[PDB]
Symmetry: C2
Subunit: 303 residues, 2 copies
């Protein structure tokens, strides 16, 4: 009724928005699905290990953990949409089950739920301001890194990145969550000089180049060891970046172009992928180059 | 191994490298939607509201920028989520730069927006209030958008009621109206205008749902909401009306057309004719909007406005 309706609207607009625990469950489906995947012990082991120097009390360490786990899982949900990945940790990808729209919305929602947890880290406004800025800064870096990686891949051959460009993209893309985890911890430390940022930056780069490497190496050694999905994706991986620049430099026009063509196919044909990998093995010698580059990186730490 | 060790050492000891060219690459999907008019009515509302807030112009520019970023980014994401081919008569960004880049750019702008919040003030208490406001309304916006998408993609599992729909809108459409307002109120150097902005938000969304069908009916507007299978205000009224009146076949027929995700003009017209001739849903929505607007017009004791 013109009265009851106005009264109902009046009561609706004078209250916070209504949100039930049922509503919360319904929209958390994409996120709950990715949680079932393993790998959480080591990222927690990373946090733990790192704490053996930061000395954070345990309730605080646990909040950092929650923050990082949400950001990380949300990134994976989105990354998989962005890469059109059919699988994640041996399971069907969330966007294929619940659809791209819900998966995108849920992942972004969790970015903000993570943000909200930052206030549970302190009651001291000065520290709080610093933690948010860190949060803000590394998420900004994560997106800058991912944005370049995606652009190079989706607009290939518009830009053939050099090894230097690739490494700057990784510092942003992969170093983002590594630095975010460490920087939050270093701002919380009750310690008493320098940070482990440079170290974490190097760990990030070794992590990413090794990942790029094994994606091809595992497939080359065994078709049932991996799928070499980085090729299907058309990714400008470390070994690919070396092959594309080597070929251009040595004047191997045909090879340079065949590398691009296979990347642009977004193919899942195993033989075509194995051909590209053997091109990197025997012609550009990108695999050995990458293997050696990883080792040198690793020696920079162990030495 | 030292020239290589040297360059890595230089890399890991510096802030990550990011140039203005890199910034340009990444902004392309956002810039594309900028060629979209309307920015003035959104800034108008900002300027008009500022007559009660009176923020110093310099602070008003930053709020306005935070607002533009969030609104444009949310539209880029909205278009991917609805698989929309057009936005303001122009091809949507994701069809041009692809879905991957558009999502990433839109998300990047949410964070650029967030960074601008820290420049509204250096006062530590207030800053936190501003972040909290920001955080809370984005959360609401996603909850609402999440629920809207869920009802659409799971139909016919859940048919919302008018009440459920109104709560979804308070979260979805009210989020950014309230974010804008609440920020301005928190910064004001001078009763809350939040109730008024919520109503404005509800009016804006119902009217949006209404016009999407009316513009098509009065002239083949494409009625994309039908193609999208959206639980719009008229559709929600038609579904619950036929269910209550026990009109089983009309109920099912509306569900069937929505589930078709059809671009067929004749089929879309058939659904509209059900709404006009069977449920009288469009006339019901027209009336419902008028009533909401009257709540503002007949606000003599100024309960809602200042
Ligand atoms: O093969 P994908 O697409 O699953 C990929 O690993 C996704 N990805 C993107 C950004 C960061 C990470 C990542 C990898 C390892 C550890 C972290 C991490 C996350 C949080 C805290 C510490 C470390 C992030 C992975 P990639 O970086 O695009 O190769
Ligand atoms: O027709 P669509 O799909 O572009 C749609 O308007 C998208 N949408 C979602 C959320 C908010 C808004 C919106 C519309 C107009 C103005 C604003 C706004 C946002 C911030 C500050 C002032 C105004 C938000 C639009 P809808 O809500 O999904 O119907
Ligand atoms: Mg990836």
């Amino acid at each position: 009724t013109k009265n009851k309706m106005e009264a109902k609207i009046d009561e609706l607009i004078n209250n916070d928005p209504v949100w039930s625990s049922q509503n919360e469950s319904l929209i958390s489906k994409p996120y709950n699905h990715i949680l079932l995947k393993p790998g959480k012990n080591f990222r927690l082991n990373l946090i733990v290990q790192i704490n053996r120097v930061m000395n954070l009390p345990k309730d605080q360490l646990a909040i950092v953990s929650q923050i990082v786990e949400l950001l990380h899982n949300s990134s994976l949900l989105i990354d998989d949409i962005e890469d059109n990945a059919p699988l994640r940790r041996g399971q069907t990808t969330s966007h294929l089950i619940f659809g791209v729209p819900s998966t995108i919305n849920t992942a972004n929602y969790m970015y903000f739920r993570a943000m909200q947890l930052v206030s549970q880290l302190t009651t001291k406004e000065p520290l709080y301001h610093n933690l948010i800025t860190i949060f803000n800064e590394e998420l900004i870096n994560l997106h800058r890194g991912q944005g370049l990686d995606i652009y190079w891949r989706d607009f290939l051959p518009e830009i053939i990145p050099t090894q230097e460009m690739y490494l700057n993209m990784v510092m942003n893309k992969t170093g983002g969550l590594f630095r975010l985890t460490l920087r939050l911890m270093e701002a919380l430390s009750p310690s008493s000089g320098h940070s482990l940022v440079p170290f974490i930056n190097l760990l990030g780069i070794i992590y990413q180049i090794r990942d790029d490497y094994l994606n091809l190496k595992d497939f080359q050694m065994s078709s049932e060891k991996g799928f070499a999905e980085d090729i299907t994706e058309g990714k400008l991986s470390f070994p690919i970046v070396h092959a594309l620049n080597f070929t251009k430099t040595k004047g191997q026009t045909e090879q340079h172009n065949e590398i691009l063509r296979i990347l642009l196919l977004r193919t899942s044909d195993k033989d075509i992928k194995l051909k590209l990998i053997q091109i990197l093995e025997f012609d550009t010698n990108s695999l050995a180059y990458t293997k050696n580059f990883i080792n040198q990186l690793v020696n920079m730490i162990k030495n």
